Amino acid sequence: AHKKGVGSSKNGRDSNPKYLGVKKFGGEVVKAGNILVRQRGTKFKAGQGVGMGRDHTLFALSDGKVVFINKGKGARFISIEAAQTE
Template sequence: MAHKKGGGSSKNGRDSKSKRLGIKIGDGQAVRAGGIIIRQRGARWVENNNVGRGRDFTLFSLVDGKVKFESGKRISVYPVGAEPKPAAAAAAKPAPAPAKK
């Protein structure tokens, strides 16, 4: 039986606040201008089209639009109606010819 009341308690009882890092807006989701897309430490993800980077490496949208996660850990935001079309799908599918009667 311990004869001192708080013998081991002085080494316990510490914890840090969570930093709430990570992806806030997913691929294909709408974002407003100034909206935070990713909170991160260091440049794990990098900004691309219409995306800015804060001094704490936060990525945020510069325009209203949809978020696009691209190859090479790049993040873009495309305004509605200006999303990039896949090159392979556009080239493989020609426009249909009008039907003759």
């Protein structure tokens, strides 16, 4: 009443990462960028990454959310010109 060996055979299961909302769309106080949950969002867009430059999301409200390192936590604000006096 056990299990065997020499049959590696070991399928893998599912995930579901994304950039949801990609860069520069109607910004809604909701899941910003994703690739590491428990995540700790940030302020506006993010531009820090194992790449160099940065990314703007011409979309501004409360905040977004990170992914733990990847992408690059937000902080470089960027409400967007669409955040002035009505």
